[PDB]
Amino acid sequence: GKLPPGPTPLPVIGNILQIGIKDISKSLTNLSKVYGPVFTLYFGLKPIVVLHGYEAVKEALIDLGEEFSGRGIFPLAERANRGFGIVFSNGKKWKEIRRFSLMTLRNFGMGKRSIEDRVQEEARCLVEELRKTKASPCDPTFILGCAPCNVICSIIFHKRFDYKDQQFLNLMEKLNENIKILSSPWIQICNNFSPIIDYFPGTHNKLLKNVAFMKSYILEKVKEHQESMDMNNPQDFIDCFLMKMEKEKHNQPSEFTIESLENTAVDLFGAGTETTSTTLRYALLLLLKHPEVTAKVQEEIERVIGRNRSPCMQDRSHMPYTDAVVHEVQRYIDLLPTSLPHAVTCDIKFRNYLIPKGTTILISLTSVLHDNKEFPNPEMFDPHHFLDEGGNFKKSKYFMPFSAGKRICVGEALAGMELFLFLTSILQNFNLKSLVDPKNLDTTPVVNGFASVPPFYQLCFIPI
Numbered sequence: 001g002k003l004p005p006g007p008t009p010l011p012v013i014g015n016i017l018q019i020g021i022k023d024i025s026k027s028l029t030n031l032s033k034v035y036g037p038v039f040t041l042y043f044g045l046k047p048i049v050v051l052h053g054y055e056a057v058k059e060a061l062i063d064l065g066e067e068f069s070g071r072g073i074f075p076l077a078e079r080a081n082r083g084f085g086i087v088f089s090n091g092k093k094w095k096e097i098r099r100f101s102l103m104t105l106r107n108f109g110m111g112k113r114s115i116e117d118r119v120q121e122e123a124r125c126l127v128e129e130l131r132k133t134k135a136s137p138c139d140p141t142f143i144l145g146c147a148p149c150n151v152i153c154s155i156i157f158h159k160r161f162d163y164k165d166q167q168f169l170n171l172m173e174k175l176n177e178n179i180k181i182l183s184s185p186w187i188q189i190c191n192n193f194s195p196i197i198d199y200f201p202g203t204h205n206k207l208l209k210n211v212a213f214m215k216s217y218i219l220e221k222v223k224e225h226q227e228s229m230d231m232n233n234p235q236d237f238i239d240c241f242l243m244k245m246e247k248e249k250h251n252q253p254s255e256f257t258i259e260s261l262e263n264t265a266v267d268l269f270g271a272g273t274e275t276t277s278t279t280l281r282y283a284l285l286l287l288l289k290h291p292e293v294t295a296k297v298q299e300e301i302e303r304v305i306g307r308n309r310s311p312c313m314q315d316r317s318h319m320p321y322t323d324a325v326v327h328e329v330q331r332y333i334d335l336l337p338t339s340l341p342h343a344v345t346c347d348i349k350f351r352n353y354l355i356p357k358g359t360t361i362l363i364s365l366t367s368v369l370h371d372n373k374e375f376p377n378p379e380m381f382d383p384h385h386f387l388d389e390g391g392n393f394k395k396s397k398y399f400m401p402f403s404a405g406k407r408i409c410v411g412e413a414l415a416g417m418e419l420f421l422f423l424t425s426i427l428q429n430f431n432l433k434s435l436v437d438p439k440n441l442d443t444t445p446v447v448n449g450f451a452s453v454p455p456f457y458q459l460c461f462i463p464i
């Protein structure tokens with residue numbers, strides 16, 4: 001090797017990296033091999049305490065659940081006055097709003113129409129829309145995004161929309177824009193480790209504008225609801241919230257305000273749309289990649305549900321294989337590898353450490369969902385991670401895709417309904433045909449700053 005002469009070396013070419021959440025999570029696991037299950041990362045003078053492995057996560061989020069139930073401060077969210085909902089609130093405000101929302105989402109105050117009724121209706125509309133693709137190759141991203149968005153619409157203001165309604169398209173457009181901004185990959189430039197969009201000029205303003213747009217649209221619905229508010233006839237989240245505001249009068253200052261109603265409603269759209277959509281889209285990809293799994297799901301659907309009626313949640317206890325498949329989708333894909341960041345609510349002694357009030361806590365959900373003792377070969381998609389040796393469904397304490405403790409996803413039950421009812425309804429009515437031969441079908445996730453996101457794929461929905 002004797003290359004021609006030339007100038008003194010220039011900067012490095014083609015080695016600037018877009019860091020996704022799955023790469024962050026891999027580094028966290030690597031660091032746990034050096035420092036153990038509880039360690040601190042410093043970003044300048046800001047410490048972040050990482051919890052890695054089931055025993056650390058359980059001891060903190062569950063055994064000390066109150067102390068680890070804080071959210072912390074996010075500056076851009078504070079500019080949008082977002083701390084007045086569920087996701088970003090803390091202390092007394094969070095406790096009452098999350099409790100109120102939980103019970104509303106378990107059919108208290110929501111009228112006769114159950115949450116399951118609303119999901120079932122959306123499931124039938126979802127199947128109709130898949131029919132309209134006429135078995136031609138289809139990128140399912142849009143249709144699978146509409147259905148969970150429509151479920152939240154029906155819960156919050158008792159309205160679902162045709163997938164071509166402009167009002168509905170406008171709302172999803174802003175939600176998709178915000179999700180794209182907020183979940184962009186990371187990058188290190190000089191002594192800075194930052195989201196990429198922090199460099200992109202219009203991003204922070206577009207996020208604030210879209211959030212203002214969404215709150216303003218919800219406010220328009222709230223005013224309509226105020227015209228007929230009826231303590232004896234609430235029928236959606238807005239009605240329930242307004243009834244609570246009525247009962248909390250004279251007890252000022254209430255946590256329940258129009259400002260709190262708008263941020264809670266925005267929270268539910270942002271937390272409940274793209275998580276479910278992305279899990280569904282990933283589910284269909286895994287079902288294309290694993291045709292023998294799909295055949296057994298469809299066999300189980302035929303013998304428990306048949307083809308004459310819609311799936312319902314009572315069917316799931318009789319469909320252990322399908323239940324294992326849905327669980328395994330969520331465990332395998334590891335949708336939110338580091339959940340959402342917590343903070344401790346007070347000074348707390350934790351093992352040999354003293355964690356001051358307000359310290360950021362980062363939870364490795366990957367380290368639990370992919371525990372190689374609880375789930376041997378955890379890198380592999382295998383419904384038998386949730387079946388015992390007799391083929392019965394096997395619940396795991398390591399099933400934490402909604403996190404754990406006091407901040408566990410408030411939509412856990414609703415998301416489980418949407419996953420089970422939508423996937424069984426699709427597979428009750430359609431065979432899935434991949435253009436690619438399954439053996440050559442790529443399932444490697446794409447880089448994303450917050451979530452595990454599946455690659456692009458198309459498929460045919462072939463009616464039965």
Ligand code: HEM
Pocket residue numbers: 071086087088098267268271272273275276279335336339340341401402403404406407408409410411412414415
């Ligand atoms: C496959 C679907 C879903 C997954 C995997 C999921 C997962 C999660 C996770 C990991 C968190 C963070 C928990 C923590 O901070 O430790 C969370 C929070 C949250 N989720 Fe979900 N979620 C899903 C769907 C939904 C749906 C349908 C709703 C509708 C209500 C929802 C509402 C929320 C809310 C409001 C929070 C904030 C809770 C709080 O800060 O107290 N999610 N979710």
Ligand SMILES: CCOC(=O)NC(=O)c1ccsc1NC(=O)c1nc2cnccc2s1
Pocket residue numbers: 074075076077078080082087182207208211267270271272340341
């Ligand atoms: C977690 C980091 O968030 C941030 O750093 N957000 C911001 O900086 C920000 C600024 C304006 S709006 C907004 N975030 C949201 O509205 C979210 N809603 C939900 C609902 N479920 C899950 C996640 C979100 S983030």
